[PDB]
């Protein structure tokens with residue numbers, strides 16, 4: 001459970017993300033894809049991309065990055081009271097996209113990395129810790145829905 005102070009650190013850097021959601025999404029998905037190639041394989045939509053330049057040029061990838069970050073921002077703004085937002089997501093990711101919880105840990109790490117590169121002044125160690133907690137809560141809650149559905153893992 002994040003404290004109010006922690007939530008404030010989280011949403012303060014997230015307000016910064018909102019200035020350029022598309023650029024953040026592309027950086028995050030590209031980082032995810034490059035660092036963990038097995039993740040790109042889950043995307044029939046994007047598996048034709050072989051290089052970072054191709055990824056950076058993809059308008060559809062940028063479009064999905066916005067979809068992803070928009071869903072995550074709505075979750076973060078609920079400050080833990082994200083039951084309704086998390087349900088559709090867990091259902092599709094477990095049963096439809098078949099995304100292991102480990103891959104959610106990978107994108108969390110890509111998120112934290114990109115937030116740090118783009119917002120050093122509002123992403124000091126305290127903010128990083130707070131964001132990590134927020135992302136851990138998200139994973140924890142998603143994981144519980146996965147287990148229920150028979151996909152824990």
Ligand code: HEM
Pocket residue numbers: 039040042043044045067068069071072088089092093097099103104107
């Ligand atoms: C911060 C975490 C994530 C969020 C908020 C997020 C959000 C979304 C949203 C909003 C959608 C569209 C609606 C839906 O199908 O539920 C979606 C689709 C999808 N997501 Fe995620 N996602 C996350 C992480 C992941 C990860 C890590 C992977 C893969 C390693 C993944 C794979 C997919 C796939 C394959 C689709 C369908 C893409 C398509 O073909 O249109 N997601 N996600």
